[PDB]
Amino acid sequence: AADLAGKWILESSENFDDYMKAVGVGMVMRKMANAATPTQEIKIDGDSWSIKTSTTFKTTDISFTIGQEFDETTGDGRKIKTTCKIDGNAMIQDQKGSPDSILSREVKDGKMHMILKVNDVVCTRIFKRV
Numbered sequence: 001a002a003d004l005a006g007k008w009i010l011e012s013s014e015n016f017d018d019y020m021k022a023v024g025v026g027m028v029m030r031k032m033a034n035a036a037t038p039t040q041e042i043k044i045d046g047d048s049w050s051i052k053t054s055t056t057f058k059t060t061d062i063s064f065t066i067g068q069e070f071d072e073t074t075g076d077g078r079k080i081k082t083t084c085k086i087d088g089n090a091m092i093q094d095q096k097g098s099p100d101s102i103l104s105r106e107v108k109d110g111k112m113h114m115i116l117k118v119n120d121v122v123c124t125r126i127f128k129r130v
């Protein structure tokens with residue numbers, strides 16, 4: 001999953017609104033989130049990762065070590081417990097909370113494919129390298 005490193009910007013999104021409804025995001029925040037075109041900046045050093053997700057207004061930062069659970073507060077304010085793993089080319093972010101989510105990032109054809117899963121919802125957000 002080493003190629004995930006660098007800076008990325010949203011290029012396409014499918015079913016993000018349904019993902020947001022499923023994790024309980026309110027209408028006002030969903031409208032703002034759907035209207036955003038975020039960047040992700042990903043740094044990797046060994047099993048040390050950080051990811052900064054930015055819009056012009058609001059940023060979130062997380063840092064973690066592969067395999068080691070950490071406390072995370074999502075952009076929408078949910079408190080969760082997250083453990084990140086590597087499965088081949090993908091880094092998978094297993095988020096435990098109310099509800100659980102699984103977020104995977106994998107580079108395919110030079111684009112970062114992010115897949116956000118909650119219940120039976122599958123959201124796909126594709127990012128291009130900046």
Ligand SMILES: CCCCCC/C=C\CCCCCCCC(=O)O
Nearest residue numbers: 029033038040053058059060075076
């Ligand atoms: C992520 C911070 C800016 C938006 C604030 C949170 C709004 C809605 C919750 C979105 C879920 C967070 C996952 C976004 C993944 C991404 O686009 O990179």
